[PDB]
């Protein structure tokens, strides 16, 4: 594997990115994320789409009358976003955001961005900085227990030992990889200057793709309910969470 | 298909029961459960093995110096337990125990006994009655979410719908079935007269059986850590819990 920085990996695949997440599972997950955004973002306001990639969620909010800026360190992702019609795009990393303090009511960090940033402390610090008091961070991240199950399936025993300590493993494709940090419950606990508002599981159950196609509405309603159950969310494929900047 | 009382099913398969559960996975789960018993029963005391079957756990305790009585409504299971060297055996159901009150320090209801009892109110009440103040119930039960995931792979959606309401499904053989009630968190919340001391996941991850044999110590120790993690236990194959009779 060639070891890349995250944005260098995304520079290589930007133009195929959207086509990779058009499976029944990913359609389902997008529908869930979309329903959650409409739940937490009641009214139009100022939003930073951080690591916003090809602009999926920026467009979603633009078309609902929000004032949206997309930020991303991948020049190719940004170019794809611009072509798709995202109006405000900026090249930057989460670790060092070029926006003044208190500029946004909400920051999105969807598609596991905070699992990819190289310095989580600076990243959470910058997010808190750019939000108004009581602003929300709305994010999804990789789940430690899902990674661990996957590693056990792909028989990575020399690697599990390290991973249990670091929570960090490689991700990517057959030829190119970058590092991901998979979150545990204690990672979302007493974050400095944030109140945890909600945590939810995305993909609490695994469904065969065939059944998702056959029964999308039924399965979306089930996952809606299951995502709200605290006792089971760390079973999920990915983790969604919301923080509120303390006053 | 034939529908049976739980103990009628066990009367049919009693002579094969020990042979059926001799697999790598179950060898692993038994090692987990044995280690938990040693943790919670640090001294020889008076134990009731309720639905103790062929006496696996009665014998485990007898050889460690405990005073154990095995109770089970299946005559054939009792006969197998006697032949294996279980000294004290009684034919009864959990819903109506012919023992005096306050007679045991602990009651074991292992191998999902409480998922099979027809009346959990009566069963829980009797258990409470035969325990001394601060006596323990130590038990394992089927996990609702594990059943649901299995059904999502295999069963008609209409069966899933019914199961979401009832938490009950048939178990057994292609030719013989009885009903199991799979537990949720809410079921272990505020049981009258008991304090929940601990809840643990048994078989939090899935392993290929081939790999369980190759890396048994490694897998045992990992599962031992994961079973103590409250955030992930509803992912587990089965649920282990400990209640204390309060005052
Ligand atoms: N340090 C970083 N700061 C901000 N974004 C980053 C950082 N490292 C990687 N990224 C970006 O995170 C994105 C992960 Se892909 C998710 C894209 C979008 N949020 C969606 O959900 O569709 C990539 O576009 C990548 O360039
Ligand atoms: N109402 C009931 N009360 C007590 N035991 C029951 C009841 N219904 C079924 N059982 C018993 O529950 C047992 C489940 Se099999 C488990 C046996 C033993 N506990 C072990 O772990 O190996 C069977 O022996 C069955 O006969």
């Amino acid at each position: 594997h060639m070891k890349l920085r995250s944005w260098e990996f995304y520079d290589r695949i930007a133009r195929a990115y959207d086509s990779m997440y058009e499976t029944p599972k990913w359609k389902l997950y997008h529908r869930l994320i979309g329903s959650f955004l409409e739940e937490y973002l009641k009214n139009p306001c100022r939003v930073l789409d951080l690591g916003g990639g090809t602009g999926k969620w920026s467009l979603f909010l633009q078309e609902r009358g929000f004032e949206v800026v997309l930020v991303d360190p991948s020049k190719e992702m940004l170019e794809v976003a611009r072509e798709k019609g995202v109006k405000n795009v900026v090249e930057a990393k989460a670790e060092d955001l070029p926006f003044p303090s208190g500029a946004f009511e909400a920051v999105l960090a969807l598609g596991d961005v905070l699992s990819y940033v190289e310095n989580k402390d600076k990243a959470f610090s910058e997010i808190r900085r750019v939000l108004v008091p009581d602003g929300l961070l709305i994010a999804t991240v990789d789940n430690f227990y899902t990674f661990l199950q996957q590693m056990i399936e792909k028989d990575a025993w020399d690697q599990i030992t390290r991973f249990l300590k670091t929570q960090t493993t490689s991700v990517g494709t057959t030829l190119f990889s970058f590092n991901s940090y998979a979150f545990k419950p204690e990672d979302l606990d007493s974050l400095e200057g944030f109140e945890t508002v909600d945590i939810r599981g995305i993909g609490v159950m695994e469904y065969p793709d065939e059944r998702i196609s056959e029964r999308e509405e039924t399965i979306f309603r089930l996952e809606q309910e299951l995502s709200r159950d605290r006792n089971i969310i760390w079973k999920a494929d990915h983790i969604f969470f919301v923080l509120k900047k303390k006053r």
Side-chain angles (χ1 to χ4, degrees), chain A residues 16-21 23-92 94-121 123-161 163-164 166-173 176-185 187-189 191 193-205:
Chain A
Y17 178 79
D18 290 341
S19 93
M20 289 156 44
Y21 295 96
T23 60
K25 190 180 82 180
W26 280 107
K27 288 172 168 191
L28 173 62
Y29 287 5
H30 292 153
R31 212 188 155 183
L32 285 158
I33 294 302
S35 77
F36 300 171
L37 290 181
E38 295 184 315
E39 179 176 354
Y40 286 100
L41 300 173
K42 305 312 301 179
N43 283 81
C45 62
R46 300 167 306 166
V47 181
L48 182 58
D49 186 23
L50 178 66
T54 61
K56 162 76 155 176
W57 299 112
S58 290
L59 290 167
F60 187 81
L61 292 181
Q62 283 190 175
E63 69 200 11
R64 286 160 178 69
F66 287 72
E67 185 165 67
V68 185
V69 185
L70 184 153
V71 183
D72 198 284
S74 170
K75 294 173 197 274
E76 305 293 329
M77 294 287 159
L78 291 182
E79 179 57 18
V80 168
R82 218 153 19 212
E83 286 171 19
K84 290 168 71 185
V86 179
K87 298 205 202 76
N88 305 101
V89 309
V90 170
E91 197 186 348
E95 290 88 337
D96 194 4
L97 291 172
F99 295 95
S101 300
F104 302 100
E105 279 79 31
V107 176
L108 302 186
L110 299 179
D112 314 311
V113 169
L114 291 164
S115 287
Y116 309 155
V117 311
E118 297 186 320
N119 190 333
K120 285 172 280 304
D121 295 5
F124 282 108
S125 182
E126 283 294 277
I127 289 159
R128 183 193 133 83
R129 193 184 54 77
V130 300
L131 283 167
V132 298
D134 300 310
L136 311 171
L137 168 67
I138 304 190
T140 66
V141 290
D142 291 320
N143 182 358
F144 169 90
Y145 302 107
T146 301
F147 271 28
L148 179 58
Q149 184 63 91
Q150 286 167 359
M151 294 177 70
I152 290 165
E153 258 148 17
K154 76 187 79 135
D155 234 61
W157 291 99
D158 283 27
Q159 301 176 64
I160 283 163
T161 308
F163 177 77
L164 294 163
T166 64
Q167 309 181 209
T168 299
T169 195
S170 295
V171 301
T173 67
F176 302 116
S177 81
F178 60 103
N179 288 329
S180 183
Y181 178 94
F183 279 63
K184 279 174 105 173
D187 295 300
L188 297 177
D189 175 298
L191 274 163
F194 280 111
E195 152 183 20
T196 300
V197 171
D198 203 357
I199 303 168
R200 301 215 203 168
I202 314 303
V204 177
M205 309 294 139

